[PDB]
Every structure is written in C-alpha cells, then in structure tokens.
Amino acid sequence: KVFGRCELAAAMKRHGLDNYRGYSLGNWVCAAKFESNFNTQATNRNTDGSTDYGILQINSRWWCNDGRTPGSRNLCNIPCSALLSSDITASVNCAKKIVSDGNGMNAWVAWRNRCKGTDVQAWIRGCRL
Ligand SMILES: [Cl-]
Ligand SMILES: [Cl-]
Ligand SMILES: [Cl-]
Ligand SMILES: [Cl-]
Ligand SMILES: [Cl-]
Ligand SMILES: [Cl-]
Ligand SMILES: [Cl-]
Ligand SMILES: [Cl-]
Ligand code: NA
C-alpha cells in the first residue's frame, strides 16, 4: 500500500506513535517519507547482506527474521514479511522497540540526515487528526 501523507499520519496516531518516546507525529511521517516514500512494500538490500523492510525500513540485522541474514537477530520476534503489510501494526510495534533502544530516532539514518532538526510539523500540516 502507498499511503497518503495525512492518511499515514492518522494511522500512526491511531497506533500510538504520536509523541512516542517524545517524538512528535511529524517526525514519524518524515522518517516514513524518506525511508519508503510511504510504501509499505518497500524493501532494500544493505551492503552487509541484511535487508530493510516496509514503511520504516526496519533492518533484518537486528529486528526481524528473513532467513538470509547470517548472524543477525530478530528482536521484534516477527518475520520481516510482516513488515510489508498494508496494516502498519507490526511496523509500528517494532518501531516502538527500536526507538526505545537508546539512541531514539537516530536508529533511522534517513531520519537523522533528513528530518532531525527540521520543521517536521509541516508533515502533518492540514491533516485531520
Ligand atoms: Cl508527501
Ligand atoms: Cl510534528
Ligand atoms: Cl537470518
Ligand atoms: Cl535471497
Ligand atoms: Cl533475536
Ligand atoms: Cl520468521
Ligand atoms: Cl494501518
Ligand atoms: Cl530521544
Ligand atoms: Na535477522
């Protein structure tokens, strides 16, 4: 599924991401924009052989199992395929664990490079929330 901006903002809020670990909703929408362009089916292979999955590009090195990432963990206890669903529940639940891991949203390199410090409220501007 390719979400619209406000559509995703609404789904993220419904799933309790808004201000989760102190990160306002626009941070989450901004991260999804640059990680996946709001596409739940996005997958991208990393140089190290791991793969990033879904709207928030969650990495198989640590968070989900894809059966082809040697030495990796599965800390969200889910198949990486669950992170590609039209329903964002699994991605949200796993993202909550990631953002609680110690480094906040810096875990998402695209968030650090493209969203951190910027006017992230623009991402939810105009949305019925
Ligand atoms: Cl957009
Ligand atoms: Cl915001
Ligand atoms: Cl694996
Ligand atoms: Cl393969
Ligand atoms: Cl594990
Ligand atoms: Cl699995
Ligand atoms: Cl959803
Ligand atoms: Cl933080
Ligand atoms: Na893994």
UniProtKB/Swiss-Prot annotation:
Residues binding substrate, per UniProt? D101
Write one Pfam family the protein is assigned to: Lys
Any one GO MF term held by the record is:
lysozyme activity
**Which reaction is the catalytic activity of this chain?**
Hydrolysis of (1->4)-beta-linkages between N-acetylmuramic acid and N-acetyl-D-glucosamine residues in a peptidoglycan and between N-acetyl-D-glucosamine residues in chitodextrins
UniProt-listed SUPFAM superfamilies? Lysozyme-like
* Main subcellular location of this protein, as a coarse class: secreted
Q: Name one GO cellular component term.
A: extracellular space
Catalytic site residues? E35, D52
| GO process annotations (BP) | cell wall macromolecule catabolic process; defense response to bacterium; defense response to Gram-negative bacterium; defense response to Gram-positive bacterium; killing of cells of another organism
What region holds the C-type lysozyme domain?
Answer: 1-129
> EC number(s) per UniProt?
3.2.1.17
Cell compartment(s), UniProt: Secreted
Q: Which cysteines are joined by disulfide bonds?
A: C6-C127, C30-C115, C64-C80, C76-C94
Question: What assembly does the database describe for this protein?
Answer: Monomer.
Q: What else is known?
A: Lysozyme C is capable of both hydrolysis and transglycosylation; it also shows a slight esterase activity. It acts rapidly on both peptide-substituted and unsubstituted peptidoglycan, and slowly on chitin oligosaccharides.
Family from the record: Belongs to the glycosyl hydrolase 22 family.
Q: What is this protein called?
A: Lysozyme C
* Organism (species): Gallus gallus (Chicken)
Its organism's taxonomic lineage begins at:
Eukaryota, Metazoa, Chordata, Craniata, Vertebrata
